[PDB]
Amino acid sequence: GLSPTLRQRICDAAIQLMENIKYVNAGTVEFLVSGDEFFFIEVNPRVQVEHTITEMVTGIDIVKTQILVAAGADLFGEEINMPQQKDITT
Amino acid sequence: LGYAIQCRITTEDPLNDFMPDTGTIIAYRSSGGFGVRLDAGDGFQGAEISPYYDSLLVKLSTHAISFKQAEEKMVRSLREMRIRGVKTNIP
Numbered sequence: 001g002l003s004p005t006l007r008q009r010i011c012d013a014a015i016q017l018m019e020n021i022k023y024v025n026a027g028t029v030e031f032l033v034s035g036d037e038f039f040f041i042e043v044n045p046r047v048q049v050e051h052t053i054t055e056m057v058t059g060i061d062i063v064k065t066q067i068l069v070a071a072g073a074d075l076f077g078e079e080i081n082m083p084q085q086k087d088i089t090t
Numbered sequence: 091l092g093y094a095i096q097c098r099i100t101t102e103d104p105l106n107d108f109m110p111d112t113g114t115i116i117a118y119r120s121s122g123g124f125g126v127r128l129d130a131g132d133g134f135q136g137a138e139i140s141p142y143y144d145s146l147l148v149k150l151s152t153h154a155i156s157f158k159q160a161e162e163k164m165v166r167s168l169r170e171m172r173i174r175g176v177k178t179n180i181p
Binding site for chain 1: 124125153154155156159
């Protein structure tokens with residue numbers, strides 16, 4: 001229901017944060033929303049119980065990746081196989 | 091979105107010329123996991139297996155982002171499997 005560009009901004013906010021502090025491994029940026037604005041709540045620096053759901057719509061094994069990042073491996077490499085940002089959707 | 095692989099677990103003896111084995115399963119453990127789909131047929135701890143139909147224990151389908159990934163997912167599930175008291179095409 002949330003507007004297709006109102007999500008993109010929320011998505012963009014998150015990314016702007018973790019990009020600014022060079023975040024390594026999975027994390028989750030919690031936002032609180034109302035009308036047409038986000039407010040940042042917390043960060044869960046790890047897998048959330050609810051990961052599976054995101055993996056089902058994006059087709060990425062999140063946990064599997066956690067291990068490979070740890071391993072020294074590359075986001076867009078032969079091993080993790082992450083699709084370019086503009087290629088990731090649902 | 092990514093790649094998937096499927097295959098069937100039957101009672102064909104890969105040593106014997108894939109003559110389906112008959113008789114009664116005494117132990118059945120199956121892998122699941124995210125990316126894995128099981129479509130059980132005659133595989134479960136009770137089943138006695140009739141010579142009468144196309145043998146088919148479990149339809150196994152896997153699904154990751156890279157084909158190689160989904161390939162490993164498959165292998166582990168094959169490996170993680172456990173059927174007893176009839177030879178299987180699994181190896």
